[PDB]
């Protein structure tokens, strides 16, 4: 016989108090990109950017992240 | 015989108090992109950007994320 | 017989008090990128950027992260 | 017979009090990148940047991180 | 008494033989311009551009110029 | 008495033989310009560009120039 | 009495034989310019660029120049 008991408890807390965020300026002068890739062959769970000129301004009032992977494997 | 008990408890908290967000400016001068890719062949769960000139201004009042993958596998 | 009891407790705390964020300026003069890659062949859980000219301004009021991987494997 | 009891307790605390953040300026003059890679072959859990000219301005009011990997393996 | 004789002779020649002109490509990625000029005051024979984002493709089969200012001033 | 004789002779020649001009490519990634000029005051024969992001592709089959200023001043 | 005789002779020659011009590529990654000039005051025969991000591709089949200033001044 086998018994497995997986009873994790999480009363955890992730938080911020953040006042004014204010004067965020993001002013990029524009570059230049070239790519040559005579053939491509992607096959499983692939994430790809091949050519890109990508600006982001990401200004979250909180932006608090909490990743909580569980895995229970029996064989 | 086998018994498995998977009883995780989560009373967890993810939070922000964020005041004014205010003057976010995102003013990108526009680049230039070229790609040559004489053939492509994508086959399973592929995410792809091949050529791109992509600006984002992402300004969430909260933006708090909480990812909670469970997996229980028996064989 | 076997008994396994996996009962972790987490009352943990991740936090910030952050006042004004204020004058963040991000003003990049635009570069130049070239790539030649006569063939590519990606096959499992691949993350790829092949050519890129990517600016980010990431200004989270909190931005507190908490990664909590569990794994219980029985054989 | 076997008994395993995995009962870690974590009442831990990760924190900051951070006043004004203020005048962060990030003004990069734009470089130049070239890559030649006549063929590529990626196969498992690969993270790759092949050519890149990437600026980041990451200004989190908190930015406190807490990584908590557990693993319990029985054979 | 005074005599002035202004008898310049010009049998001059300005010329080109120019075959095919062919594949001129002019593909500009679009910039960004800002100007602040709280007051302006222009007064004689002024040529001005104050803000501009101006592309030209000027492809004259000849384009030969010949400027020939004379001036004779007596007092 | 006075005599002045101004009899310049010009049988001069300016020339080119130029075959094919061919593959001229002009592909500028787009910059970024800012100007602050709280007041301006221009007054005689002024040529001015105050802010500008200006591309030119000037491909004359000849483009031969010949400037020939004369001036005769008597007092 | 006075006699002045100004009889310059110019049978001069300016020339080129130039075959194919061919593969001229001009691919600038885009910069960034800022100017602050709290007041300006221009007054005679002024040529000015105050802020600029200016690309030129000037590909003349000939481009031969010939400047020939004369001046005769009597007092």
DSSP annotation string for C31-74: -EEEEE-SB--B-SS-EEESS---EEEE--S-----B----EEE
Our separate counts of H helices and E strands in chain C read 0, 8
- Residues of G with CB below 8 A from A34's CB? 27
Distances (CA, A) of F44 to E44, G39, G49: 5, 17, 16
CA distance B25 to B23: 6
Instruction: Count Cβ atoms within 10 A of the Cβ of residue F62 and give its class: 0-12 exposed, 13-18 middle, 19 or more buried.
Output: buried
Chains D and E touch (3+ CB pairs under 8 A): no
CA distance D53 to D73: 42
Nearest to B33 by CA among G63, D35, C54, D70: C54
**Residue at token pair 């790759």:** D48
**Residue at token pair 């490509």:** E25
The CA radius of gyration of chain C, in Å to the nearest whole number, is 23
CA distance B55 to B26: 9
DSSP state of A29: P
- Residues of E with CB below 8 A from A27's CB? 32
Q: Where are the beta strands (DSSP E) in chain D?
A: 2-6, 9-10, 13-14, 24-26, 32-36, 47-49, 55-58, 72-74
Nearest to E69 by CA among G69, A73, G35: G69
Contact in structure between C2 and A3 (CB atoms under 8 Å): yes
Helix, strand, coil % over all residues of chain F, rounded to 5 = 0, 40, 60
- Take residue A52 and report the two structure tokens written for it: 């890109």
Helix (H) or strand (E) holding B9: strand B9-10
Nearest to G64 by CA among E61, F57, F16, F59: F16
- Residues of B with CB below 8 A from A57's CB? 24, 26, 56-59
Cα B47 to the center of its chain, rounded Å: 13
CA distance A67 to C66: 6
- Using the beta-carbon criterion (under 8 Å), do F19 and G18 form an inter-chain contact? yes
The C-alpha of G63 sits at a distance from chain F's nearest C-alpha, in angstroms, of 5
Chains that touch F (3 or more CB pairs under 8 A): A, B, C, E, G
Q: What is the resolution of this structure in A?
A: 3.2
The verdict on B31 touching G (C-beta cutoff 8 Å) is yes
- Residues of F with CB below 8 A from G62's CB? 14-16, 18, 60-64
Contact in structure between D52 and D4 (CB atoms under 8 Å): no
**Beta-bridge partners for G24:** F24
F42 in helix, strand or coil? Answer: strand
């Amino acid at each position: 016989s086998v018994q497995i008991v997986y009873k994790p408890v999480d009363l955890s807390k992730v938080t911020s108090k953040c006042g004014s965020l204010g004067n965020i300026h993001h002013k990029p002068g524009g570059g230049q990109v070239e790519v040559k890739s005579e053939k491509l062959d992607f096959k499983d769970r692939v994430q790809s950017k091949i050519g890109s000129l990508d600006n982001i301004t990401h200004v979250p009032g909180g932006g608090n992240k909490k990743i909580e992977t569980h895995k229970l494997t029996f064989r």
